[PDB]
Scaffold this active site. Structure first.
Site, PDB file in Angstrom:
ATOM      1  N   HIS A 125       6.831   0.174  -6.331  1.00 22.43           N
ATOM      2  CA  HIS A 125       7.666   0.227  -7.558  1.00 22.43           C
ATOM      3  C   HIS A 125       7.454   1.496  -8.424  1.00 22.43           C
ATOM      4  CE1 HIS A 125       8.615  -4.155  -6.821  1.00 22.43           C
ATOM      5  NE2 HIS A 125       9.789  -3.692  -7.216  1.00 22.43           N
ATOM      6  N   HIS A 160      15.999   1.002 -13.498  1.00 24.04           N
ATOM      7  CA  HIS A 160      15.929  -0.458 -13.368  1.00 24.04           C
ATOM      8  C   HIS A 160      14.565  -1.020 -13.114  1.00 24.04           C
ATOM      9  CE1 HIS A 160      15.629   0.098  -9.070  1.00 24.04           C
ATOM     10  NE2 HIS A 160      15.275  -1.174  -9.001  1.00 24.04           N
ATOM     11  N   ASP A 161      13.575  -0.172 -12.854  1.00 23.67           N
ATOM     12  CA  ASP A 161      12.196  -0.636 -12.673  1.00 23.67           C
ATOM     13  C   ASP A 161      11.221   0.105 -13.574  1.00 23.67           C
ATOM     14  OD1 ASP A 161      12.130  -2.895 -10.957  1.00 23.67           O
ATOM     15  OD2 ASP A 161      12.424  -1.628  -9.180  1.00 23.67           O
ATOM     16  N   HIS A 167      11.151   4.911  -5.389  1.00 24.67           N
ATOM     17  CA  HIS A 167      12.002   3.728  -5.245  1.00 24.67           C
ATOM     18  C   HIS A 167      13.269   3.838  -6.100  1.00 24.67           C
ATOM     19  CE1 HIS A 167      13.462  -0.332  -5.160  1.00 24.67           C
ATOM     20  NE2 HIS A 167      13.102  -0.577  -6.404  1.00 24.67           N
ATOM     21  N   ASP A 200      19.122  -1.994  -4.631  1.00 27.53           N
ATOM     22  CA  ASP A 200      17.712  -2.347  -4.782  1.00 27.53           C
ATOM     23  C   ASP A 200      17.029  -2.615  -3.420  1.00 27.53           C
ATOM     24  OD1 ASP A 200      15.502  -2.525  -6.373  1.00 27.53           O
ATOM     25  OD2 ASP A 200      15.948  -4.550  -7.136  1.00 27.53           O
TER      26      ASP A 200
HETATM   27  C1  LIG Z   1      13.510  -3.379   0.100  1.00 22.86           C
HETATM   28  C2  LIG Z   1      12.553  -4.528   0.121  1.00 22.86           C
HETATM   29  C3  LIG Z   1      12.251  -5.148  -1.184  1.00 22.86           C
HETATM   30  C4  LIG Z   1      11.415  -6.184  -1.132  1.00 22.86           C
HETATM   31  C5  LIG Z   1      10.931  -6.991  -2.301  1.00 22.86           C
HETATM   32  C6  LIG Z   1      11.632  -8.344  -2.402  1.00 22.86           C
HETATM   33  N1  LIG Z   1      11.033  -9.116  -3.480  1.00 22.86           N
HETATM   34  C7  LIG Z   1      10.486 -10.386  -3.366  1.00 22.86           C
HETATM   35  O1  LIG Z   1      10.190 -11.106  -4.292  1.00 22.86           O
HETATM   36  C8  LIG Z   1      10.308 -11.060  -2.099  1.00 22.86           C
HETATM   37  C9  LIG Z   1      10.966 -12.288  -1.976  1.00 22.86           C
HETATM   38  C10 LIG Z   1      10.843 -13.017  -0.819  1.00 22.86           C
HETATM   39  C11 LIG Z   1      10.060 -12.499   0.191  1.00 22.86           C
HETATM   40  F1  LIG Z   1       9.885 -13.134   1.372  1.00 22.86           F
HETATM   41  C12 LIG Z   1       9.411 -11.297   0.047  1.00 22.86           C
HETATM   42 BR1  LIG Z   1       8.392 -10.797   1.536  1.00 22.86          BR
HETATM   43  C13 LIG Z   1       9.500 -10.535  -1.107  1.00 22.86           C
HETATM   44  C14 LIG Z   1      11.006  -8.501  -4.784  1.00 22.86           C
HETATM   45  C15 LIG Z   1      10.423  -7.087  -4.728  1.00 22.86           C
HETATM   46  F2  LIG Z   1       9.030  -7.184  -4.649  1.00 22.86           F
HETATM   47  F3  LIG Z   1      10.752  -6.384  -5.848  1.00 22.86           F
HETATM   48  C16 LIG Z   1      11.095  -6.276  -3.633  1.00 22.86           C
HETATM   49  N2  LIG Z   1      10.928  -6.559   0.099  1.00 22.86           N
HETATM   50  N3  LIG Z   1      10.075  -7.558   0.356  1.00 22.86           N
HETATM   51  C17 LIG Z   1       9.947  -7.500   1.676  1.00 22.86           C
HETATM   52  N4  LIG Z   1      10.637  -6.518   2.296  1.00 22.86           N
HETATM   53  C18 LIG Z   1      11.249  -5.932   1.288  1.00 22.86           C
HETATM   54  N5  LIG Z   1      12.101  -4.863   1.293  1.00 22.86           N
HETATM   55 MG   LIG Z   2      12.705  -4.660 -10.237  1.00 17.77          MG
HETATM   56 ZN   LIG Z   3      13.853  -2.263  -7.633  1.00 18.32          ZN
END
Ligand SMILES: Cc1cc([C@@H]2CN(C(=O)c3ccc(F)c(Br)c3)CC(F)(F)C2)n2ncnc2n1
Ligand SMILES: [Mg+2]
Ligand SMILES: [Zn+2]
Length: 343
Positions: A81, A121-122, A85, A233
């Site tokens: 983050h 956004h982050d 990103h 995102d």
């Molecule tokens: C581009 C991208 C972005 C995210 C995460 C998704 N996010 C989660 O909460 C999450 C939810 C359910 C899950 F099973 C998992 Br694993 C993570 C939120 C975040 F952390 F911002 C970004 N992931 N995660 C795993 N490959 C990803 N690729």
């Molecule tokens: Mg975010």
């Molecule tokens: Zn993001």
């Protein structure tokens, strides 16, 4: 003073043309993370120029250059983050504008708000999720937990603070109505990046794609903005296997750091943040199958030229299935030792 000279160059040298950055810059095959971090502020200006937002909205170039630098500097450095990103999410927005003809579905000011929301956004992410904010009783929970989307509200608030820093208000010449419309758009779009929100509106997105997008329906605009934001995102998943592999590395480092802090506080982290329980392959497969794929499927339903994105994402999912077996240790480990078993 690193920033002052950086600003000088970014302002006085001129905006470089998009194609000089990379011959492939405007294609869905391009991987924005390949761009060196020091060139990314110039890349943002180049994209805004190429979308003609600088001229259409008469953005003051000194103000813009300061704004972009302030936004960049408003990201910390957790493994996922971070500014790179936000840059890459912003780049995907630019890809959608270039490849999908957004102006047929959205107002100009909406597309502009989307891009500026992607940049912001982050902002000031600390490498922890919303629930960690509440469990640790952080300052951000104290301000926002009663409203939900704790980090997203913080991000938006940081965006506003940058705008109200002297010399950084890229919108300060807008009419009062257009200023308010921009800020309202940024709020909705950045809030939309909380995946809980996305999951709540998922059925309404399905419905929109069933009946067909209606440019005269204001609720359809709002729903589409949300879907497009989520699509930017998670756009790391629309690139090649190597990127996906690398990105999973960064996310699980970040997640597992959170879990370590939770264990130290006496709490049980969720499985995906617990380095002793997380089985990365089944987690990625689930995430790909149950969250990412439906997103890009919706996008394909609304825009036929978005098919390749869905297909990449399905192909990346299958790849995880294919390498899953390598997470089982067969034979001895490289060192020929079983010392790791008393740990
Ligand atoms: C581009 C991208 C972005 C995210 C995460 C998704 N996010 C989660 O909460 C999450 C939810 C359910 C899950 F099973 C998992 Br694993 C993570 C939120 C975040 F952390 F911002 C970004 N992931 N995660 C795993 N490959 C990803 N690729
Ligand atoms: Mg975010
Ligand atoms: Zn993001």
């Amino acid at each position: 003073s690193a920033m002052d000279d950086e600003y000088t160059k970014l302002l006085h040298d001129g905006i470089q043309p998009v194609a000089a950055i990379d011959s492939n810059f405007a294609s869905f095959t391009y991987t924005p993370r390949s761009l060196p971090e020091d060139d990314t502020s110039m890349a943002i200006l180049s994209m805004l120029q190429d979308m003609n937002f600088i001229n259409n909205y008469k953005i003051d170039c000194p103000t813009l250059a300061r704004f972009c630098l302030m936004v960049k500097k408003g990201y910390r450095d957790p493994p996922y983050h971070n500014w790179m990103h936000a840059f890459s999410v912003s780049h995907f927005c630019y890809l959608l504008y270039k490849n999908l003809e957004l102006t047929n579905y959205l107002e100009d000011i909406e597309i502009f708000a989307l891009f500026i929301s992607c940049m912001c956004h982050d902002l000031d992410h600390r490498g922890t999720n919303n629930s960690f904010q509440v469990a640790s009783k952080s300052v951000l929970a104290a301000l926002y937990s009663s409203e939900g989307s704790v980090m997203e509200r913080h991000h938006f608030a940081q965006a506003i603070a940058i705008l109200n820093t002297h010399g950084c208000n890229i919108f300060d010449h807008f009419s009062r109505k257009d200023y308010q419309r921009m800020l309202d758009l940024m709020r909705d779009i950045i809030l939309a990046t909380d995946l809980a929100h996305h999951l709540r509106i998922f059925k309404d997105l399905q419905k929109m794609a069933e009946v067909g997008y209606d440019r005269n329906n204001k609720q359809h605009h709002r729903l589409l903005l949300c879907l497009l934001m989520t699509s930017c995102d998670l756009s790391d998943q629309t690139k090649g296997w190597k990127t996906t592999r690398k990105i999973a590395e960064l996310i699980y480092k970040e997640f597992f750091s959170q879990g370590d802090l939770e264990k130290a506080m006496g709490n049980r982290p969720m499985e995906m943040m617990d380095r002793e329980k997380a089985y990365i392959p089944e987690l990625q497969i689930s995430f790909m199958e149950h969250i990412a794929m439906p997103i890009y499927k919706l996008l394909q339903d609304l825009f036929p030229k978005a098919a390749e994105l869905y297909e990449r994402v399905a192909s990346n999912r299958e790849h995880w299935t294919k390498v899953s077996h390598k997470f089982t240790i067969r034979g001895l480990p490289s060192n020929n030792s079983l010392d790791f078993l008393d740990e």
